[PDB]
Symmetry: C2
Subunit: 271 residues, 2 copies
């Protein structure tokens, strides 16, 4: 009755059919009850681990390799994430010269592991649970009446640092359109992103529309379709339906002559 | 000093490169040290885990399904291991009438997890570390101037019962030879079996000779070649070189009508 369950867990958390049956017949407890106890303890540990890895300020490195209608560019970033306050701070610099797209179209692409999940729903935070091996984030971004972005991001710890390498491809863009023609305002609205579980891929998915302000009136729609998949083998947290509430501020560094964006975001989960 | 490792280990026992590199930088320790610390932990745990799983008296079920030279036969048995005393006791009945080989030629085939490892050697006990998922035990047995056995067995827990399930194939056997002709004494010689790690297969191997007494004089050699491989994905204990000392007593159950063998083995690990 209990007690030995702790010991069993300490010995071996790989609840295989054989380990389950063994513990069943050996404790009188039935298999489902053992399954439930194990999954429960696993969750609590998954929660405590994520809290540990994301306590305090976490240094961030970002590398984005881009190609939009053959126009190639690189963007590198650094800054920090403070999940306690749902705070993400980044300075992103285009290193190849002039960014051929407007920076706000890259805002969604440029680390949801930094969201502030309230205590009562920390067991729904997939993004942290994937650490340190990380997760792959893929998105397709459809700009209405214009082309599309496809992105592939790999978010993981490399040592003490949270790293994000991204590859981006954009095709079918209008050279005189809102994107390649630089007709979008340098600002950002608040949005809610709805997260659901992607169980057949052991992760999560989301879709959401960003509204970009066209200069002197009008909106450029950007329709986002997103999928996240764990990279490693460990257990992860699969969330019930919830959402992330975003605020973003875009600014500049007065001393940085290179084409760049300063990004501040606050992210809080549906609690 | 650093109880961080313990907490890290509590959190996540899968020391991937990412987990390793992370823990290294956050704690300021080198990757090797962490690898080492985690390894020493897992070993202590496997040792404790084995002890718990074999602590008092464990029931055993054996089921053998065999065909030597067309002659198909079934042996089934039960008993109990008491690894604390290195002891094993089985009553093995041939469920299909009469056995077409001598029971002594099946002794090695018909549970090395019930060996007694002395405390200073328990980290070398592969057989227990593989439980409860178990291991596959394969052997070829060459009977000099005669046929050969080929065996594959699975030794795994099913509930709290240790189970040995075996397939046996014997070919090229002389019809009036020592085996099919039934010319072997009903007894068994004591000796040592030398274990080595088989790192490639994540398990162990051993070869050894059994000398079976031919009736009225002489000896029938049975050269054993053996390999064991985990069934599960869990970690296992890979031993340094050592041996198991065997003593076997074959007997009969007076009130038992069926063609059978009562086997009792004492098994103790040694070397260092």
């Amino acid at each position: 009755q209990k007690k030995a369950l702790d010991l069993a867990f300490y010995f071996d958390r790989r609840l295989t059919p054989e380990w389950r049956r063994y513990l069943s017949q050996r404790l009188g407890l039935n298999e489902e009850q053992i399954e439930r106890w194990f999954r429960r303890k696993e969750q609590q540990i998954m929660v405590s681990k994520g809290e540990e890895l994301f306590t305090g300020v976490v240094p961030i490195l970002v590398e984005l390799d881009g190609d939009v209608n053959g126009h190639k560019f690189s963007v590198s970033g650094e800054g920090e994430g403070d999940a306690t306050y749902g705070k993400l701070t980044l300075k992103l610099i285009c290193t190849t010269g002039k960014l051929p797209v407007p920076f706000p179209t890259l805002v969604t692409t440029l680390l949801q592991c930094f969201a502030r999940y309230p205590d009562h729903m920390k067991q729904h935070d997939f993004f942290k649970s994937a650490m340190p091996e990380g997760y792959v984030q893929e998105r397709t971004i459809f700009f209405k009446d214009d082309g599309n972005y496809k992105t592939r991001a790999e978010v993981k710890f490399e040592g003490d640092t949270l790293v994000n390498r991204i590859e981006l491809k954009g095709i079918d863009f209008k050279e005189d359109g809102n994107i390649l023609g630089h007709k979008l305002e340098y600002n950002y609205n608040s949005h809610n992103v709805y997260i659901t579980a992607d169980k057949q891929k052991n992760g999560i998915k989301a879709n959401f529309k960003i509204r970009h302000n066209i200069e002197d009136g009008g909106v450029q729609l950007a329709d986002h379709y997103q999928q996240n998949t764990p990279i490693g083998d460990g257990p992860v947290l699969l969330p019930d339906n919830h959402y992330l509430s975003y605020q973003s501020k875009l600014s500049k560094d007065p001393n940085e002559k290179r084409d760049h964006m300063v990004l501040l975001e606050f992210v809080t989960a549906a609690g």
